[PDB]
Design a protein around this ligand. Sequence first.
Ligand SMILES: [Cl-]
Ligand SMILES: [Cl-]
Ligand SMILES: [Gd]
Ligand SMILES: [Gd]
Ligand SMILES: [Gd]
Ligand SMILES: [Gd]
Ligand SMILES: [Gd]
Ligand SMILES: [Gd]
Lengths: 251, 251
Amino acid sequence: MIVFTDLDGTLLDERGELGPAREALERLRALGVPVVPVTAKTRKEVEALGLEPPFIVENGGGLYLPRDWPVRAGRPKGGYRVVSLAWPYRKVRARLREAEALAGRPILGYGDLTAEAVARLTGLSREAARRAKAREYDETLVLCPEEVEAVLEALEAVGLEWTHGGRFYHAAKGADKGRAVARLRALWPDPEEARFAVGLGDSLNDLPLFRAVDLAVYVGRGDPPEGVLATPAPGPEGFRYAVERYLLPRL
Amino acid sequence: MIVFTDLDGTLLDERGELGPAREALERLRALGVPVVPVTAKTRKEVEALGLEPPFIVENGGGLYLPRDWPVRAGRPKGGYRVVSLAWPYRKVRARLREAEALAGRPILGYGDLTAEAVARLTGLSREAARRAKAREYDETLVLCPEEVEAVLEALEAVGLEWTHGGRFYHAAKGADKGRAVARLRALWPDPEEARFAVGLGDSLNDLPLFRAVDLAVYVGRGDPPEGVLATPAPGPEGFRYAVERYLLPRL
Ligand SMILES: [Cl-]
Ligand SMILES: [Cl-]
Ligand SMILES: [Gd]
Ligand SMILES: [Gd]
Ligand SMILES: [Gd]
Ligand SMILES: [Gd]
Ligand SMILES: [Gd]
Ligand SMILES: [Gd]
């Protein structure tokens, strides 16, 4: 069993805190159950969380493996090895300019804003904002509601893919959580341990994760996406419940 | 006689060139008729144009005099004395934050953007955009056509003023071309030279300028404001005609 999980609103709250999920991570660990972060956050945001490879960044754009991963894959980049699944940031940024000209409205993303601007919009510190700006694959967008339809068509016209985390929209190409989750199972040292994957998430950019796992659990605020399990309370408390009720029994 | 003049779209085309207006300038100086730029542009932008003081920047936010101007006024700064008429940038920015929270929606201006992004947005070079970002009084806002009115309402609620120069909206407090002109006239070394003021413009924010002079000339696109003269053609060409038809005969 491998547990794949979203961060914000799932394993943590929107404020980084694990809450009633730490004790639920403790257990999973104690029973040797692998937990893999699958997030829209960048590498630097994940590291700041004290979280360790393997994990998936930027909506599936990047898979990170411990430098000494028993299955040789990707290219050494830091003290990890990286398997890039999506266009690099810079290509996405280029395409966005074409999208912008086509739409005839400003299309502003984190790459256009100062760290201080990103901080003010998100409620983060200047440092946390620097780390959110260190993007390698995926772009976070700041769209006013009124311009959204026009902008999403403009993205599709110039070949970009879009999703959202619940506040801000994201633009990328080849970044998909299922895809990255599927790749990592296929790179897993123990094929029996990876045989049964669990998936937990909270927003739209989680459906692809739900579809690439064998047990899908939604701990968000709405109605669960079709044929995915729900918990009594959102977030980490939903996470805790999921483990107690859905996981350890199986375990 | 003093000639007060808008820049972009007036003395210079939207491309930044003098064209037919160089010969007019050339003749004005030869007759010893002071010309005073009155512009939305920053001091840094005005200097990249090779323009000497006295000049009025940022929609009247600031009056820049030569340091040895015969009439003592304003604060010393290198080669200038500066007369501040408007809140400082820092303060307008702080008021923007309050407005952004009141409207419950991002309000982004140049202060939030990289030079890179301002350059893309404006079709300027990075280096010019840096000049446009060096703002002392007035903020330029990047709004979608749709959201403009929730934003303007919010801006007034927090005590800020607003104005548009044909594309992007601007926010400030105290920045008024007409008031800067009236102050400059009252600071003029020789009163008799300042008795008769000309004012040339092209846009929305040029009205206050037209109201503060004795002879007003509109060289914009479309028909004049009630009580302002017009020219057969717009731009630098309208400036040259204005000088030949209205101004030179006089002297
Ligand atoms: Cl997240
Ligand atoms: Cl101008
Ligand atoms: Gd999330
Ligand atoms: Gd969320
Ligand atoms: Gd989110
Ligand atoms: Gd203008
Ligand atoms: Gd104009
Ligand atoms: Gd303009």
